[PDB]
Each structure stands twice: as C-alpha cells, then as structure tokens.
C-alpha cells in the first residue's frame, strides 16, 4: 500500500 | 564645510521518464520491474543506469544491539557491527562492509584499479527492508530507525619527521549522530519489519569522481583520535571490497535490540538507483544511452513526496 | 506575489537593523529538509589607534565575527602581517573547545546574507580620519610542494587563493569622512546556494611547520588557542575589507554591528536539534529579486541612511 | 523565430557553436542566474604541424586553461603505454596572466569556468603524396585524488592529484569519425554539469604523476609533462569533454596541416590586476537558450570534414 | 418619590503546522508546527521534546504513569499492588526529558536564567509492547483529569504565633477511581492518546521557584488536604518549575502473576517560550505567527470531536 | 440571529423570575470542555430590628448567598463590626464539612449571574423606613509584613481590596420606600470568562492570629464552624450593598431571594460526574447582546416591575 | 481609509504609539468588550537628568504603577551586580492616589491595567563636550513567587514575592538600538499578552526582596528598593515589557539631557473616593482597531532618533 | 417587565 | 491513518 | 518625516493589502 | 532610507 | 555552411512548441 499512498499527495496537490 | 568626495563608477503533466523517475525512487519493490531510466535534470550526456538489488539472510545475536548502516557507498550494501546490550558503539567499534554482486566485474581487483571502467557517479535513490522470519512464540525486541547527515571532509594535523610537515588525509564529519537516537525516528516491535528510504540532501543533482586507494578510514599510520572520528570503518582486503566514493545521500542507521532468550532471524533487501559514466575503452560502453531532459513539475513533485513521507513504515506497507 | 518567507529572506539579506525582530525563515530554495537558523549580533566598542591604519576583514568564516590588524600609516599589510579573530558570542557552545571538535553539533553550512555597520561617538572637536571600503573575491584551494624526507615524497596543504586584492584599493569602492559612518552587505557569489562541508584541525593559515613562501599567500592569518576560536570552514561569499586612518593626536570612537542569515545542519544528538524546522519550499520571483537588488546596489552608503 | 532570444543567448550560442562562421566578436557572456564582475577572455590558435611517417600521433584537447593541446607519438599501429609521455604546446600569453612561478597562478585571477571548446585541422598537403586516415572521440576525463601510505619515520599517510578517466585513449570510442587525411576534421566540446560553476585556482602543480611520487602507485595509463615552469603549468580542470584525435601516416608519406582552437572563457579578477579594468557583469537569465544550449549540444554530430567548419 | 440622578440611557500554512503538532505527530518526516497562531506577535522560542523509554512492568502489580504539563518533565510513575489504588504512603518520581539541567540548571533557585514564562501547544503519549505472544497478559486504561496548582492557608503556633500560605494541588482525587469517560483495551493493542487546552485563550504563565515536594519540607500531609505526595529527588537532577493549562493524563497498567510486560514509551511535546537576551537560545527565535481564526476553530472542532484513545496500530 | 444557548444565557443572565423553570445551559464561549451547571436558590423571610440599621452584602462567593450585618441607626459598619453568612441549601453535600476538604468534589468554577429581591409584607399601617443599594468592586488580593520571630521571616496571608466602598453611598445609587421593594444584578467584570481555583482552609477573613491592623480591612468577615460554612473562592463578579432602616416602634417585614447561574468542573471520582455535559460553542450575538444589555441597566428597579 | 475606524479606536492608537505629536493627549478607554465604569489617568512626567563621567547608567522603565522608572550606576564596561540597588522616581501626584502608609494603598482604587508606556530623551549639551552612546533593549520581566523552608519552632515554609526575567539587564540584546549619545532616543513598549486583563492592588510591599530575606534565596541578580512609606511604593505589575536603558560616559564627558514619559491608564474607582465623580463606561469593541494595533507594534522598529519622535 | 425592557434594548440595539 | 481521520473531520465541516 | 506620518502609511498599506 | 530603495527598486523592476 | 545547420535545427525545434 505505497504506490496509492504516493498517487495520493499527488492527487491532493 | 569640507568639500564630499566624489564617488564614481556606481551601478502541464509530467512525462514518461519523469513518472519512472519517481517509481525508481519511492516504490521499488511494487512493480514487476525497475521502471526508472534517468534523471529528468538538464544533464542530457551519456550515462550508463545499474540497478544494484541485495537478498540477504541474517540472524541476530540476542543479548546484542546490532547496527546496520546504509551509506552511499557504491558498490556497498552496508555496514554492520554489533555491541552488548542497552549500550552504543564506541571507539573500540568497527563496521564491516558486505558487498553487492559483481563488485570485481566493475571497480577490478586492486586499490588503484578503481576507475579502469567508470569515472563518476551519482545517485538517485536508495532504500532498505526488513523482513522477520522466526515465528510468534521465540521472538522479543524493537526496531529502530533514523537518519543522519554523514558527509566526507578533510582533517589536517602536524607530522614530527624531519624534516616536519603537515598531513592531509580524509575524514568523516556528522558520524556522532549514531551514537544516540535521534528524535525524529520510527519505533515499533520485531515482528512487524520497517521500510524505509532516503533521499537528495541538496539543491540539485551534482556528478561526484571515483576516490581511489582509499581501504580504512582513518586509513594505515594514523590514529582515530587524531582525526576525530567516533568509530572505525574497515574494508577488508583490495581484493574483495573497498571504498570507491560517497555521495549526496543521507545516511540510514537501524539499531535491533534483543533480550536474552530471543531467537531473531530475517532477510534484508537492498535497493539502488545509480548512474554511471563510461570509458569508452571498456565493455559497459555499448549499454549505456542519454539521460532524459528536464522536467520540472517531476521535480517538485519529487520534492513535496519526500517531504510528506514518514520516517518508516512496516513492512506490511513496503 | 511574495510568500512570506520570501520576503522574510530579503529583510535579513537587505535591512537588518529597520525592523523590531529579526523576521528571517531560511532560502526559498529547491532543498526542503531539516536546518537550523541562526542569526549572529555583535555589539562592540571599539576604539582605533591614533596615527596607525586599521584594517577590517569581514570574512565567511562562521563562529567569527571579523579579523583586525594594524600597519603603520600609508602601508598596506606586509608578509610579516598577522591577522586575529573576534569571535561571536556564544562559539565555544556550538564549536566546542578542541581543533578536532568542530562537528559535534552540526555537519554543514551554508550562509544567505553579513553585513557590518560603524557608528562614530566622537564629538565635533576631536575626530580626524577617513573610511574606505572595497571587496575581494577569496576561495580557499590546495598547493603541492615536494619534500626532501627520507624517502622522499610529496605534501599537499590547505591555501587562501585570491588574498592579493587587499594590497590595493580597487576602482569600485566607497569613502569618505570618518565623521559620517559606514554601511555595507554582501552578496552571494555562485548560482546556487550550496551546502559546505566542516573542516577540522585548521587553527593558522599556512599550517605549522609550513614555510609562508611555499604556500604563496601574502600573509598569515592566526586565530590562538583552540579553546577560544578557530577555523570551521569557508563559505560562499565576497569578502568586505574596511581601511581606517587615524592622524596622530586625533581620538575616534565608534560601535562595530554585524549580522549573518545562517542555515545549518544539525546533528540527531546535538541539544540543537530541538530548535529546528524544515527549509521554505521554492519560491523563484524572490530570488529574482534577490539577485536583481544584490546587482543594482552601491558598495556603501554613510550611517545616516541605514 | 529567434526574436524570442536576448542578445546575450545568440551570442553565447555562436561564441559556444560557430566561431570561424564570424569575422569577430563571437559572444559575451553565460546568461545564467549569476549577474557578477567576470573577465571574458577569448583565445586563438595558429600552428603548422607535420606528421611523420610510420608513426601514430595522438593529440587531445583537454580543459586546461592557458594550454591549447597535448601531443605524443607512437609507432603506427600501437597505442600509448606507460613509457609514453605527453607535452603542451601554450595559447600566446600564458605568462603574462599565469606568472612565472610555481606559485604565483593565483596573483591575477581566483577563479574559472569554461563556456566553449573547439578545434579544427585543414591539410596543406599535395594529392600526389598523402596517405592516411583521421579519428577523433571524446572521453570524460576528471581531476581527483588518490590515497597510499608512505614508509617513513614515523610512518605517515599521503594524499595527491591523480586524473581518473585517462584509460579511454587506450582504444577507440564507438562512436568516432573516421575519413581520409586530405579532408579534414572539425569538432566541439559541451559542458558536462547540469549548470556553471566556479572552479579553483591550483598551485604547485608541473607533473602529473608529480616529483617522487612514482607511476603505478598513482593507478595512470601514462604520464603528462609540462616541461620547464617558467613557461607552462597546470592551473586547473574544467568541466568539459577531452577531445581525441589519431592521425595515422603510413611509410613513404607526406603529410602537413595546419590546426586552430578556440575559447570561451569566464575569469573573476582581482581589484590589484590590471586586467580587472575591462570586467563586466555578466549577463541575466535567459531559459530559452539555456534549453536551446543542452538541444543543439545532443542534436549535433561528432565531427564534420573541415569544408563544413 | 425621591429623584433618581445619574441613570444610564482557508487555513495558512502555520495553522496547518500547528494543527499538524497538535493532533498527528509521529506521522511525517518532520515535526512541522512552529506557533500558535494567536493574536499574540511577540518573540517567542519553540521547542519539541520527544523521549524514547523502555519499561518492563512488575508481574502482580500497578503502575500509574500521569503525564501532566510540567516543563522538562516527561511523566511520573508509581507502582500499588494489584487491584490498587494510590493510598496517603504513595510518591511518584519523574524522568526527565534529555537536556533538563541545560534549561533549568542545577539549583532550585536558577529555574529562570534562560527563560521566564512559557505556555503549551501540544502533548501525547504512545505505547508500544516488545513481548511475544505468549508471555503477556493485562490491559490498559486512560483517563484525563483536570489538576491545578493553588494555595492552602492554616495556622502555626509559633511565639509569636502567625500565619501561613504554601502551594497545593487541586484535582488529584480523579487518580483514585477510573472515570466514567476511559479507553480500555489488551495490552498488546498499545495505546495512542493526547490532549487539549481547558482555558478559553492561551496565557503565559510564570516560572516558579524553589519548588522541589508537594507538600514542601516541614509541611504534613493531613494540613494541605492531598492525597498523596509528589517528590522529585536531587535538586541538581530534577525540579518543579511550572504548571500549565492543560489536562493530565492517567495510565494504569495491570500485570496478573506470572506476566512479561514489556513496551517502549514515547511522548511528545510542542511548546513555546520567552527567553532573555541574556541566554543563548535567543539566536534560535523568531515571531508568532499572526491570528487565524479559522485554524482555532477547527482547533476547537477536532478537539470536541476526538476520541480518548485509540490502539498503537493508528498512532 | 440568536442560537437557543444563547437566548437560554440571556435568560438565566436577566429574567429569572418571569419564566416557569431555569433555561440557562452553559456559557456560549470558545471553551467546549465538561462542566456541570448549578442553579441556586434561596427563599427565607425575614422581620427587621426596629431602631435599627441593617446591611446586607451579595459577594461572589460559592454556596454563600450573602452577609448580614447590623448597627445601631444612622452609622455604618466599624472595626467591630462582624458580618455573617448566610447559605444555600445543601452546602456540606458539596464542599464537605472539613477546611482542608473543599476541592473534594469540584476543582474550578466560574459565575454567571447573581440576583436579589426584596418583597415587603406588611400593611398600610405598621410600616417605616426605606431601602438603599450600589455597588462595589470588591476582589481579593494578598498582603505582606514582618513578623518578629526567632529568626525573623515574612508573611504572606490573604485579604479583601476594595472593601471601603460600603462605608459610604457612591452617587449611583437606588432609593426609595421600604414598601416599595427593591430588584437589583451583576454582571461579569472582566473581558471573558476564565476559571478560578478552589481555595482551602480559609474560615474567617483576616485569619487567626493575625491582626485587623496589619490588613487594612475596615471590618471582619466570620463564617462560622468548619462544619457549616467557608470560603472556597471569589468569582470574577461584582458586590451588591443593601441598606434597611427603620425608625423605633415600626414593623417591618419581607421575603428575601436570590439567584445564581454557575458552572464547575467535575472530578472523575466525584458523584456529580453523571449529571454533566459539554459547554455550548461560540456565539458572538450572545456576547455582544449580554455586553450592550449589561451596560444599559439601572441600578435597581422596584419589586412591582 | 481611515474612516473604517471610529473614534475611540483612532484615539487609543494614538495615546499608544505617537503622544508627542499632539498639544492634548487623544483617548477615552481601550476599545475591547470590557464596558464597565474606568477612570482614564495620564500620568506625564518632565525631569532633567545629568550622567555622571566614568560610568554606566541604567534606567529600567518597568509597568509599576505611579512610579516613572528606576535607576542605578556602575563603573564603565560594567554591568549591574549583587550590591547595585535601583531607587525609583515618583509621578506627580502618588500620595494623592495611594495614601501615606503601606496598608492604605487600596483605599482609593482597587485595579488597573495598562494601555500605553512611551519615553523619550532630549540631549541639552554642547557639540564640543559630549561623549558616549545610548543603547536599548526590552525585557520580558514578571512577578512571580519564591519557596524556602525556615528553622523555627516549629519549622515552617515560606512563601515570598519575586521578580523572575531580571537576568536579561547582564548583557545587551541581539535586538537593539545604538547610535550617538547627542541623537537622542524615542521608545514605545506593548502588550505581551492575548487580551488586557486587570491586575489586583498589591499591599504591604516596599522592597524586593522583602525585609528579613536575604538575597540569593530569592534568586534575584540584584535589589529594587523604595524607601520610606510615606513617599513611594510599589503597588502591581501591569502586563507589558521593561524598556532597559544604558547610558555610557567616558572621563571628561559633559553629558545631560531631558527625560520624558507618558502613560495611558485605566483604573477602577471606589463609591467612596473623589475619584468616581470623573468616571465613565469604557468603550465598546473595535476589531480593526485592535488588528491595526498588533501590525503596527510589530512593524515599528526599536527605536528612532529623537528628531523623528 | 424586566423581560420586556431586554427585549426593547435588543430591538433598538438590533 | 491518523491524521487521515482529521481530515475527514475538518472537510465534513467545511 | 514625522512618527504619524509613518503610522498612517504602514496603516494604510495594511487597508490596501486587505 | 535603505528600505525605501528596496521598495522603490522593487517597483521599478 | 554550419551555422545554416544551426539555424535550421533551431527553427525546426522552435516549430513545434
């Protein structure tokens, strides 16, 4: 569960 | 009523190789394989990519504090030493180096054989896990983890020959972050593994030369007081391993702690995004390409997601 | 179209003293990791010798504030000229108090604004002098020299590269009254700012047991004991040489100020690292500005304009 | 379409890419975000050179300011070994920016950087007479140092300069051109660094290996020799690509040409020079041909014959 | 009828750092906060104490951890035998947090040669167990409670007879019993909790001096009506030196016979202080951020609406 | 505009009498943390010495609903005078019957309002006199001297400031006659509310073995037995002064009451726990509505309105 | 622009940074939510101070009720130690206010609190005999309480009134002002506090540390004394910072100078004391005001010559 | 009433 | 996932 | 200039900001 | 005044 | 000539952004 955690700040930024 | 004196002379989405960029450096083991190809910066020359990956087997003493460094040493996994219980290492300490395959193919056999096929180097990214393998009934401990900023300089002192002269040799500053825990750190049981990586601690992406002869540090004939250091760094005979360069990297520093009575065993893996430059009289010539040209928004988002990551995580989210 | 922090960095690189508080947060720059700020004041009295030439370095060299020495009147420094540090307050906490102690609380460095400020005391029936400032480019690099030992082998050393331009006044420079003050910055040389490394062991330049003409520097610089002060580093930044000339029979008094924007790296065991917080994140319109006020200001100006 | 382009940027591409395309004035300065007082010093180069038969002459143009090339000679059919050694041949004026002592380099300037490296070789020769071809390649040559220690009393431990990159001479680069003599060969060099820096002045330095330091304790292929120092020396090594170029004569030949270089570089004078007169600020940030710079730099080739120069 | 006279006729980046230091902790890189955006603009000093500690709890025992906002003090513990609570032959000991003596010195009258007033912004507390899972066995309980420091005043019969005021402890009955309000789990779950202001503003407060026991020497327990005592050892160790407008917290772990209880403790702490220009911390200040008051609301909303605790497992 | 807490502290601030039950909840501040509300009532009727002055005191006192004190017609209290308290129902169920057991249950307080009434219940032919009131800001402070022990000390005691206001009549102030009645409120004198401690062991202003001189007070305040009546605080409020004078040979009789709205902060072990609750949030309309209102008031009204 | 203020705010403002400015003092009350009955006192003072040559002078202008400020001299180069004692210099008008004994201080008044705290130094020498500097700085000093156990018969502690952040008068403060002595100087002090709040009227005390305690177990640097009861006192300590003030003056100097102060205060009268005829409601809240308040404070430098006061 | 004297205040300071 | 809950709470309100 | 001059000017940039 | 040159540089830019 | 070369590629990249 690492590569959505990182699409994740992407997403919010 | 004095006169002034006069003066004079008075005056978008991201690209293909940007996304690999960010896999190779973030989340190594969640592909099938290594996506990452270059460094999207404004360097466009000729590069040669290897990608260094370590499957390692190792049992902890209990009664011991067992340290594991992850320095940007090419060609070098990392550096481990063991101490008694409840306590830090101290000048009586020496770590020992365990290298990556095919270290001879690349960096030759001898001291001074170090820059027979590349040149430079640098980095890109870098990471560590461990993975418990005893099961629930024999085990007891924690894990540890921070980082430090380790970086190589130069120590000079007064040599009595005659006639006298004085001495410049190489020296590592930053290393008496390992002798505590730092506090910004992750902390949690055995049983549940950690991941974790480091990254760039500059501005920008800089190439950095091969050091050659370089097999201790301090190296033969001097002291350890007199340069400073807290510790001892050995590696060994030219012949298996030695010190090529370091880079602009943070160090990673894992201590394990185990009672007496505990039977701790895992495996640690070892990742590495690194880029090379060739010699055009050497065989690793006809692999190597042209690295990819900037991006910007690859950058910042490189950038923010190292800054918004934790220290660690267990190994359930590697 | 400034960030805060943008215009916090241009207060502590271009107006010190024209605020309550120092309101600096660091370089809005690409780096965004951990550092620790530290803003260095030095308030001293200070007053020069009638019928003697004082000269004011005001080098890169954390922990030291500047280096002073003194030549007869019309003559500038000599080989046999050596110049003495005064330190900031507070170095012994930071540096510790041994040659091979100067990392144990922080690992590197890297500057973002110094300037110094003089202002005269004396009365309207006493003062008698004049003031002229100029800057120098100085690096610090190596040198090779051989050595006839037994076997013979070869020596390499530390070496100040570029400390000829203290030996004359260039063409861009500022003076005047002594009556009038003095004020004046710095600005960084390189494009980019970069994090140095901290050297150890360094306590004279040349070296003991090194002859001055082998290194080829014009003079000697010499900081004392080690458990007072001594030699971390160098940064990236010009260096501000201030001349003082005093007629005999005359009495000048003034107050020396400096000030330095400074960012460190911190060690995880150091008390230090409680104070610390994370480098602004990029900000390009406040580095163009930067370098635009740096290029298009004047050496100096007098104190009343400060 | 170049009207989006600062005067700065079109001259420091033409000083970077094309100096014999212009009668003077190729270009004046790095537009980068660095607005300092910089010198820009331009040199120029005029030698005849003859290549004698059966023999293999090599000759590289390395970064080394105040020096045009470095030359040696082989029996043809060879490379250099470690009994080859290598010598200079200066731009006009090295003593008068340089000094005349080991350790007075740095009384003039401080500080350097590189922002262009060319060179051409047009033959003289009759076309009843040549024979012979002409290769030329870049390696990535830098400047470090290496460690050994050193028995003495008490033992001690030595640090000196060592190059590291050198063994790319021993054989020829894939990528390469290769043609007749009588056609010539015109090349260019491209910085190495994602941006321009500084570099430091260097003092004390003749030899490289230098005096009582022997070969092979060094890890170097060969040896480079500067001679006498009241008339070259080593001042430093900028960040740029070695040029390498062969010119093979087999016996009964008769071969002639004449070879020019170019540069374009940036020096920080001291306020005690006389040179510091003619300073400057250097020019403001120009992204454009800072992009144009890296694309034009990867879309070219690695030679073209000398009629195309 | 007599004569009547004289009658009347989107959040900044500061307020998400302090929510950041406020709430979530141990989950960045970095610990972000850097002040509390208030109306206060002064020059202020920040500093974030974080201590690593392991413990191993006595098998058939209890022991009370409280966690109350003391500066440079990181909790106080006590052990009862088992199913017991804290009787009038109870003292309770502090660990300090690293770099105590460097703040406050090694006398209990040079308290206040740095700083003179400080006031809170943070504070938490986690639990982690290194214990296989056989050998533990227990559970774990949390409670805040709501102590303050103020004054008791008696009669002495001196000659001439007078009068006296000393310090006392208000509030520490809640110790005695559980609360209604608690977060009870296994012990192999951790624990994860943290605490909010109880006062409608943020106000410095002072530093007080010379305070080493609750009771003071030559003061019994019946006169000043607590129940039971805080001592604090050496003076050249450890010290009192303020109370802040924060809520305790109270731990009770509970090990039955024949239990292996081992964990790590850790607790953090986002403060701010006032140094004197004297001191050498005065080079490390800046200023407060300004006001927000959409960051004070939602301060105010996420504090209403958290849990008590929740497991280590989302720390 | 209004949220119903803060129409409910408005009511419980102004108009206690006019509604069936108490509404007052909470104090509508930034403060959301558990508190426990009380509502204190007291209802006694009183008869007045004839020849007589008489002076009743209203002080922000928990579980106190005021003082009493008498002297002879025309004058006004001396250094002989002592007042005495009077309490509401259920003291020691809260504060114990101890000195040093006061903060047993609660640990922090905080005032709302606090109200007065006078209702006369004579007829048209025994009835003489009149009724005065103002107000005082009384508070409480601390006082230092030497004391001449072996080895000589200081000493450090509590005392009362602003306590000559009731030797005389301020010029805003309420007269009129005894059948008339009287109807008076505080109101909060500091700019937000903030909770005050639980003092111990305090039975009689100024304490045992010490002097009325070495104070400054103008009079002494008693409360009495341990067992009965203390004093455990005084609120941020201020201190309503009523004066009742009847001339000899005249009945005079009335019924006394009074109002509180008051907050705490329970003890986890406490038994008040169970009936507590959270403050209501921020209500900036209610604020300023309770300032303008509090501002805009007379001094006393008469009991028919 | 100026207009989205009322007047109440505007004159607050002014009785808060700028008193000089005006021929009569602009104010009627702070403007936040407290709306009770004040009394407004401007207290200003006009006292003309000479230094003596060969030593350093301190003023402290401290938050302390009908008293101007506090001074003490030591050796030149020095700095106050245990045996220095700072003697205060009275308002016109103390005895008028809080009575001729230590135990009648509250008779008249029973709070305060504090709205403005301005001083100013005018040189009145010659050009030709002056010497020396002035130097500025602020302290955050507060009142606060110290415990020590005493040996009697029986045994007993103690508690006793201290001052704590006295230590920041040893040693000048990285934020300061220094220039010529013959400049003169302006400075202004603020609120360090969220919100203004009232201060209790303290009783009894005439010297700190008090009688029969001995200095080093209050932990006080050195000693504030007032004399006799009659003629001053200390009666509370406001919430705002203490303007420390050293002056130096070298052998042979002449220096002298006017000193200033101005203060806005606001009381809380008794029914029985004079006072309460002058009384009024303070004024209602004003958001902008108190915004404009803090951004001005925090904009202002330490501060001016006193040619721009 | 007192209640209606409050409620007056409130309409005209409304 | 700690600091994901906070978010929850401040976007629900807003 | 004068203080108040100042104060107006830093008051009205402020107003101007907002 | 230095500030004031900061500024009016700034506008001009 | 080259610097046509130059030119030409110049124009060409400039052509497509």
């Known amino acids: 569960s690492m590569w959505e955690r990182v699409k994740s700040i992407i997403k919010s930024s | ?22 896999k190779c450096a973030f989340a190594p083991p969640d592909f099938n394989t290594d996506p990452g190809k270059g460094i999207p910066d404004r360097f466009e020359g000729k590069v040669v990519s290897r990608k260094d990956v370590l499957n390692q087997s190792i049992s902890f003493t209990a009664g011991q504090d067992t340290f594991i460094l992850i320095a940007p040493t090419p060609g070098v996994a990392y550096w481990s030493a063991s101490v008694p219980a409840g306590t830090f290492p101290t000048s009586a300490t020496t770590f020992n180096p365990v290298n990556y395959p095919g270290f001879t193919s690349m960096f030759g056999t001898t001291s001074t054989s170090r820059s027979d096929q590349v040149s430079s180097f640098r980095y890109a990214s870098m990471n560590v896990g461990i ?11 924690s894990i540890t983890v921070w980082k430090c900023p380790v970086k190589l300089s130069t120590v000079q002192f007064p040599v009595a020959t005659d006639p006298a002269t004085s001495s410049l040799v190489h020296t590592l500053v930053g290393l008496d972050g390992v002798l505590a825990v730092g506090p910004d750190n992750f902390s949690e049981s ?6 974790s990586q480091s990254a760039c601690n500059e501005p920008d992406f800089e190439f950095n030369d091969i050091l050659e002869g370089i097999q201790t540090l301090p190296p033969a004939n001097v002291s350890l007081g007199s340069t400073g250091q807290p510790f001892t760094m050995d590696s060994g005979a030219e012949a298996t391993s030695g010190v090529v360069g370091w880079g602009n990297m943070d160090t990673i520093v894992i ?12 495996i640690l893996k070892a990742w590495s995004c690194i880029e090379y430059r060739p010699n055009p009289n050497a065989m690793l010539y006809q692999f190597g390409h042209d690295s990819p040209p900037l991006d910007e928004v690859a950058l910042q988002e490189y950038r923010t997601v190292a800054r918004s990551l934790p220290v660690a995580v267990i190994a359930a989210q590697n």
């Open chain 2, 131 to 141: 993975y418990p393998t005893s099961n629930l009934m024999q085990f007891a401990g």
């Open chain 2, 190 to 195: 055995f049983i549940k593994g950690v991941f």
């Open chain 2, 255 to 266: 201590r394990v702690s185990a009672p007496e009575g505990a039977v701790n065993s895992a």
């Open chain 2, 1 to 22: 009523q004095t006169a002034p004196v006069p003066q004079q002379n008075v005056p978008t989405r991201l690209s293909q190789p940007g996304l690999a960029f960010l």
